[PDB]
Design a binder for this molecule. Structure first.
Ligand SMILES: [Mg+2]
Ligand SMILES: [Mg+2]
Ligand SMILES: [Mg+2]
Ligand SMILES: [Mg+2]
Ligand SMILES: [Mg+2]
Ligand SMILES: [Mg+2]
Ligand SMILES: [Mg+2]
Ligand SMILES: [Mg+2]
Ligand SMILES: [Mg+2]
Ligand SMILES: [Mg+2]
Ligand SMILES: [Mg+2]
Ligand SMILES: [Mg+2]
Ligand SMILES: [Mg+2]
Ligand SMILES: [Mg+2]
Ligand SMILES: [Mg+2]
Ligand SMILES: [Mg+2]
Ligand SMILES: [Mg+2]
Ligand SMILES: [Mg+2]
Ligand SMILES: [Mg+2]
Ligand SMILES: [Mg+2]
Ligand SMILES: [Mg+2]
Ligand SMILES: [Mg+2]
Lengths: 227, 46, 122, 201, 95, 95, 72, 242
RNA sequence: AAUUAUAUAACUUAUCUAUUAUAUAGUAUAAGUUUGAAAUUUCGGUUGGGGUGACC
RNA sequence: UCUCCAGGCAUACGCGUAUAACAACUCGGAUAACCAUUGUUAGUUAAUCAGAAUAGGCAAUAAUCACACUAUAAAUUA
RNA sequence: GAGCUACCUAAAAACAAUUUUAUGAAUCAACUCGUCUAUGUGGCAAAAUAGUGAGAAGAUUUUUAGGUAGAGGUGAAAAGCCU
RNA sequence: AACUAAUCCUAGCCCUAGCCCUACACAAAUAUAAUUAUACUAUUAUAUAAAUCAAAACAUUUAUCCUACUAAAAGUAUUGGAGAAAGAAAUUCGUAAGGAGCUAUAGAACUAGUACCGCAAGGGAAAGAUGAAAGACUAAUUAAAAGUAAGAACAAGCAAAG
């Protein structure tokens, strides 16, 4: 009887009501422990493909206007409503984004380096080595999947030929084509790691059930009389 | 606490748990009815 | 402790449970919950004029009862259809194609009262 | 019900519903089955008592309980009882008849009064008639008053009773039209609309 | 022992007797001596001679073996050139 | 395919009967797996001229994978049945 | 029509009036006029149950006539 | 009590009463006959006699086929008689070790095969054995037509046989249209398998499919008794006039 | 503890495809090996009773 | 009429005639009176209480007297 | 078999007065719980009564419908709970 | 000098023989929370039987269970921790309505799959007795069980025996 709530085909900026799982799967059995209850929430459909040209428009760099930078219950970072042309779409907000700012979304692969302004989306080839980036996509057109948390910025270590190396926040180096689009700057809510829960009830407000109260080298034969 | 009152009646719950439509939903439930028909039960299901 | 043997009716169960007692529907429920009764769906009692009717509920005990001969298709056919076909055959004005002339109906479609599937109540 | 015992009192009477309540489980009575054809005793037939208290005395049948092979004769095989007994009053002494089985009686030849055994045989017209085994002779079926008390000859119809001739009037005219169509045409109802397609299934 | 078989309703022979003992028609049973093929290097010459012999069974042992085998193993067998032809009967036996 | 053998003997059933099997007769061992057998070649008569095999009408032996995947599917070769052999043999004689 | 129900019996089915054809009705297609093989055992048990009743019924009538013939 | 007939005879008695009796005689023969499939998963005994090594005497030998489980997925492809062997093994191949459940599975491939008689290419789930059988039969069409139902062991395969047989039986001009010569060659090549039109129709039908076909053939709405009596009256009147 | 263990994981050889100059890829399966989620079974004897020892 | 006690009336869920009158005085109420028992006859009334056309396009801005006021757990067919 | 109970999902409810403040704060009802003693021990009760107590705007309590099932489920681990 | 009680005979049942079946019965309702006159949401068995138990434990194994004609070949050949046990074939033979059964604690559980118990799957009773006639007023028969009553007891004791 479990029908997923993620059944909306068409993009909208209206917040969408979420049904909670409880750590259980479509079978009805717990698959992850420690999830339950909490505050009711609404899902605002984020758009991680920064360079999405508007319908019936050409594929070239465009600009959008930041309406508001808002708190999002469903993620560590904060979201910014951005409007351009006749389209409104939620997006992740960088560290310094404010209302009324203008942010560029560029398709052009700069043959030379392009000056980097935080919040604008540029292909990795355009950016210069060393620039802090966020919302990186693995393959051109996929959409952003890495560096999407609060205050998490990766570095662009190297660009050679058609590919570049990205240092993910975990210090794990990844390689992607220079065509991939990465947003510049940090991801905002840099102090999220400084937040203090304080009381056990606060985690029960975020849907975190308490931990359960339940409290390997086989010797080789030649080394069993010394164990 | 005092036990013995584990039955909290509800017609919606009863017909959903042990009703005609529920029994026919799975083949094992159909065989529940087949046994009771063979035995001669006056009540096949709730 | 529920009663498994008594009949399930609308008096039992919560308010949400409702079901009919066997009365035929006379209308339709539109959206926004408006009942619209249909005049044609409501039965009409066709009552004859009984003025000057000689038949009353009971019969004379002196009246002889008759031997039972339940009606058969052959008896109906002979009483009604045989006289025409027999006379027509002698006249020679007979063919298989014109069976409608004697009262045959190839199909029941289009008739107000269809003999099969029956479309009228008693 | 397999346990209902048939008695002299008519089935369904107050006495019968007390003699045969739903919970009674009395021992079955053994009855030699007799074919409807074989049985030859009828109400109003004079019979003779072969054996018993009144053996050799001829009487008239007045009742038959076929399930018990019983023939009851008026004024014979009589014991005595009080009818209408009340707390204040004794009642009235009367003689009550008791059932006699078929094999304890025989039918009587009309012209010569004797217990003649009879055999069933047809006639020229084809109607089945009883014939005496010896002194072959037609024993006519007697006439008995109707059980409900209705004598047709004396009957005079009151209100709500159809007269004879009216009941026997023939008005049916055979035609290939149902009762529905006939009434509408006679009463002049007109309907030109036709039912839409219905998918029977 | 199987006294009544499911298929045939009879007793069954214990095929461990049939593979170890010979029954003479008179009623006697022959056997070997346990260990006659074992560790012969450390056995005395007299001991080995005793082991090689065919030996008879006691009254109770014979009674047991008769219970464990069926009648077919107790019939008289007319084998041409049998080397036990003369041992199937008793002679000069008063007892 | 996989060929299996029963571990336990099955008693004979007779001319017109089927043997009754028991739970112990469901235990098997693997005699052979035909996958690992040496693989024979396939013989086809060409209907065209294809490089590195020969001219139309010749008889060749080729790996089964090659024969089915390319020659037979593409129509280059036809099955070397006795009927096909006669037809192509006649053509060569006339040629 | 004559149809077999999900319990393995043969029952006469009386048709109903609908405004749409049968292949388009979704309430009609939930009704099943077939029995799955797990009903086969129950089919045999009914026949054997009925055979027992009839055999008992014949036996009793024979016994009853013996009582009649002894009595008469 | 007892049933009159042994339970194993019940299926034969069912075919012999009711609408099943009215089914074609030739079709019933296919239903009645039982033939063992050609051995696939066991080696058959070459001879009917063998010399026992232990006692050195001649003893009879018989072939007992392995029980093979045919998943319903197989009926939608062409497995060459192969199936699943559901059995047990002895760990380490000694009968004094534990008995372990074992399942041997066929290696299944997806292949595309062309039928000349149908002039269509089908994509089928197939085993290497099935491909070998076709090669031995010198054509995909020959494989289906030659192989019997028991060896074929596929409802999809049997339906192919009916189409091929029906195609040949009617000499349908729907094959390679506009090319009577090309068509003629194909029909001539497979002339050995031609059978009468009536028989070919009932090839590969299951008992339920056959019964529905028979019910459809004899389905007829009743005759209005008006006509029936009219026929009788006319015949009587005409006969009297004679 | 003994006996197993197509639970997962891995490799190896075949089988089947792709390619390639022999070759590196994959793999509706079979046969091995490694790992062990599990499964099945058991708890010799004599010694005011319990450590160890011992003994048969 | 007096003396004294202090969860009552509705609805939901559930129950299924225990409802009311009469007649009975066996069974049932842990005893009587009387009936909750037995038999017979009756009953609960609703357009407001309560239950039961199609296809597209689109949504940033809580609640709390909603103003001020901040906040955090970020929150309702048109 | 989850109408009890454990946990969960969805839709709904309840919290006076007083003091603090801006609260898993305080006093104390309704409500939830069950500390200590007595009565009871075939009892009113197969776990209650009478007192005395703990919490009482919260990890609170309650209602309705749904989910997870025995080689398993649930578990703020008592090997608790699953009529 | 009698209360409680007792007596009873047929309701049916049992095992065979024989036999394929063609019982599947008005109108209406019903797979919707079955038995609710019409659309909405469409509909679908199962991969190998396991274990107990026997082997005086248990670990391969353990008749029937898991059926293919009778009598013989034969408990033979064979198979097996060669133990417990298991066990063929070739071949031969073969033409056919009854009761030293039960009679109400028995015989079917059965007067009924009911009452009743259980949320459910499921479990599952007890009992009747006049006569030809009750349109003869529903009878009789029996120092007869334990239990009582008629009729409490009267120094002292396995309660009796001499
Ligand atoms: Mg811990
Ligand atoms: Mg209970
Ligand atoms: Mg509750
Ligand atoms: Mg034989
Ligand atoms: Mg009252
Ligand atoms: Mg009163
Ligand atoms: Mg009353
Ligand atoms: Mg309303
Ligand atoms: Mg619940
Ligand atoms: Mg308050
Ligand atoms: Mg507090
Ligand atoms: Mg307190
Ligand atoms: Mg406190
Ligand atoms: Mg808890
Ligand atoms: Mg602990
Ligand atoms: Mg319990
Ligand atoms: Mg044992
Ligand atoms: Mg075992
Ligand atoms: Mg009994
Ligand atoms: Mg009983
Ligand atoms: Mg006494
Ligand atoms: Mg004394």
């Amino acid at each position: 009887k479990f029908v997923s709530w993620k059944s909306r085909t068409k993009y909208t900026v209206k917040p969408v009501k979420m049904r909670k799982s409880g750590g259980r799967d479509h079978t009805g059995r717990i698959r992850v422990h420690g999830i339950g209850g909490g505050h009711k929430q609404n899902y605002r459909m984020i758009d991680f493909l920064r360079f999405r040209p508007e319908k019936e428009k050409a594929p070239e760099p465009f600009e959008e206007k930041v309406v508001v930078v808002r708190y999002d219950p469903c993620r560590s970072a904060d979201i910014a409503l951005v409007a351009g042309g006749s389209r409104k779409r939620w997006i992740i907000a960088t560290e310094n984004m404010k209302a009324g700012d203008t942010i560029l979304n560029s398709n052009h692969i700069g043959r030379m380096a392009v000056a980097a302004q935080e919040g604008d989306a540029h292909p990795l080839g355009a950016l210069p080595v060393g620039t802090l980036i966020n919302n990186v996509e693995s393959e051109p057109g996929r959409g952003a999947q890495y560096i999407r948390a609060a205050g998490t910025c990766g570095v662009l270590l190297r660009k050679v030929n058609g590919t570049a190396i990205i240092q993910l926040p975990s210090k794990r180096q990844m390689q992607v084509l220079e065509s991939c689009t990465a947003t510049v700057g940090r991801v905002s809510n840099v102090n999220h790691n400084q937040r203090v829960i304080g009381k056990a009830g606060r985690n029960r407000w975020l849907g975190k059930r308490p931990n359960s109260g339940l409290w390997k080298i086989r010797p080789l034969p030649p080394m069993k009389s010394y164990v | 606490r005092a036990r013995g009152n584990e039955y909290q009646p509800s017609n919606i719950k009863r017909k959903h748990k042990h009703g005609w439509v529920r029994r026919l939903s799975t083949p094992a439930g159909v065989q529940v009815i087949l046994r009771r028909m063979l035995k001669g039960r006056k009540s096949l299901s709730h | 402790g529920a009663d498994r043997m008594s009949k399930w009716t609308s008096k039992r169960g919560p308010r949400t449970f409702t079901k009919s007692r066997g009365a035929k529907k006379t209308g339709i429920y539109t959206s926004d919950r408006k009942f619209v009764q249909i005049k044609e769906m409501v039965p009409e009692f066709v009552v004859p004029d009984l003025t000057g009717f000689k038949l009353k509920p009971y019969v004379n005990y002196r009246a002889p009862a008759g031997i039972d001969t339940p009606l058969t298709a052959k008896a109906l056919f002979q009483e009604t259809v045989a006289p025409a076909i027999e006379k027509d055959f002698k006249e020679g004005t007979f063919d298989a194609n014109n069976l409608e002339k004697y009262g045959f109906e190839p199909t029941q479609e289009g008739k107000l009262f269809q003999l099969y599937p029956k479309n009228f109540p008693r | 019900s397999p346990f209902y015992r048939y008695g002299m009192s008519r089935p369904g009477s107050i006495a019968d519903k007390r003699k045969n309540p739903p919970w009674s489980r009395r021992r079955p009575v053994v009855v030699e089955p007799i074919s409807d054809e074989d049985w030859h005793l009828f109400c109003g037939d004079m019979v003779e008592i072969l054996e018993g208290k009144d053996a050799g005395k001829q009487g008239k049948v007045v009742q038959v309980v076929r399930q018990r092979n019983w023939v009851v004769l008026e004024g014979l095989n009589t014991h005595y009882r009080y009818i209408g007994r009340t707390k204040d009053h004794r009642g009235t002494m009367i003689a009550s008849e008791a059932p006699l089985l078929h094999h304890q009686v025989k039918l009587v030849d009309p012209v010569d009064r004797k217990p003649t055994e009879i055999q069933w045989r047809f006639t020229e017209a084809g109607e089945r008639v009883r014939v005496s085994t010896r002194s072959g002779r037609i024993i006519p079926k007697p006439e008995f008053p109707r059980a409900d008390g209705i004598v047709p000859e004396t009957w005079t119809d009151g209100p709500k009773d159809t007269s004879v001739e009216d009941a026997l009037e023939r008005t049916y005219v055979p035609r290939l039209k149902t009762l529905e169509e006939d009434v509408m045409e006679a009463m002049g109802i007109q309907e030109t609309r036709r039912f839409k397609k219905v998918y029977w299934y | 022992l199987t006294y009544c078989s499911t298929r045939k309703g009879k007793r069954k022979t214990v095929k461990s007797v049939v593979h170890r003992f010979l029954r003479l028609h008179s009623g006697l049973w022959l056997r070997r001596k346990a260990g006659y093929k074992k560790k012969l290097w450390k056995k005395s010459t007299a001991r080995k001679k005793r082991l090689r012999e065919f030996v008879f069974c006691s009254k109770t042992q014979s009674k047991l073996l008769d219970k464990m085998t069926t009648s077919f193993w107790k019939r008289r067998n007319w084998y041409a050139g049998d080397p036990y032809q003369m041992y199937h009967d008793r002679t000069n036996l008063r007892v | 395919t996989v060929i299996v053998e029963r571990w336990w003997k099955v008693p004979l059933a007779g001319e017109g009967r089927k043997p009754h099997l028991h739970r112990r007769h469901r235990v098997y061992k693997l005699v052979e797996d035909t996958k690992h057998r040496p693989k024979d070649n396939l013989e086809l008569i060409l209907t065209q001229s294809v490089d590195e095999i020969g001219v139309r009408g010749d008889l060749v032996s080729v790996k089964k994978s090659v024969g089915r995947n390319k020659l037979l599917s593409q129509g280059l070769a036809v099955y070397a049945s006795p009927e096909n052999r006669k037809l192509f043999e006649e053509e060569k004689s006339l040629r | 029509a004559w149809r077999r129900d999900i319990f393995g019996r043969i029952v006469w089915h009386k048709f109903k009036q609908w405004p749409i054809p049968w292949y388009l009705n979704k309430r009609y297609n939930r009704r099943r006029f077939f029995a799955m093989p797990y009903v086969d055992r129950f089919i045999r048990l009914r026949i054997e149950k009925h055979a027992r009743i009839e055999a008992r019924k014949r036996s009793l009538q024979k016994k009853k006539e013996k009582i009649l013939h002894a009595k008469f | 009590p007892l049933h009159r007939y042994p339970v194993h005879l019940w299926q034969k008695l069912r075919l012999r009463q009711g609408i099943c009796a009215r089914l074609p005689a030739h079709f019933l023969r296919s239903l009645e006959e039982e033939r063992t499939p050609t051995p696939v998963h066991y080696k058959p005994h070459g001879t009917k006699f063998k010399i026992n090594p232990k006692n050195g005497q001649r003893e009879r030998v018989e072939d007992v086929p392995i029980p093979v489980h045919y998943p319903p997925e197989s009926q939608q492809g062409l497995w060459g008689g192969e199936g699943l062997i559901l059995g047990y093994r002895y760990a380490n191949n000694d009968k004094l070790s534990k008995r372990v459940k074992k399942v041997w599975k066929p290696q299944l491939f997806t292949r595309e095969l062309y039928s000349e008689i149908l002039d269509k290419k089908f994509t089928v789930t197939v085993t290497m054995r099935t491909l070998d059988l076709i090669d031995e039969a010198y054509g995909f069409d020959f494989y289906i037509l030659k192989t019997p139902k028991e060896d074929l062991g596929s409802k999809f395969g049997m339906d192919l046989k009916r189409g091929m047989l029906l195609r040949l039986a009617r000499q349908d001009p729907h094959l390679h249209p506009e090319n009577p010569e090309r068509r003629a060659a194909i029909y001539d090549k497979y002339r050995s398998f031609v059978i009468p039109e009536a028989e070919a129709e009932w090839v590969g039908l299951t008992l339920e499919e056959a019964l529905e076909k028979q019910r459809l053939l004899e389905e007829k709405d009743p005759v209005p008794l008006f006509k029936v009596y009219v026929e009788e009256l006319v015949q009587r009147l005409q006969e009297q006039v004679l």
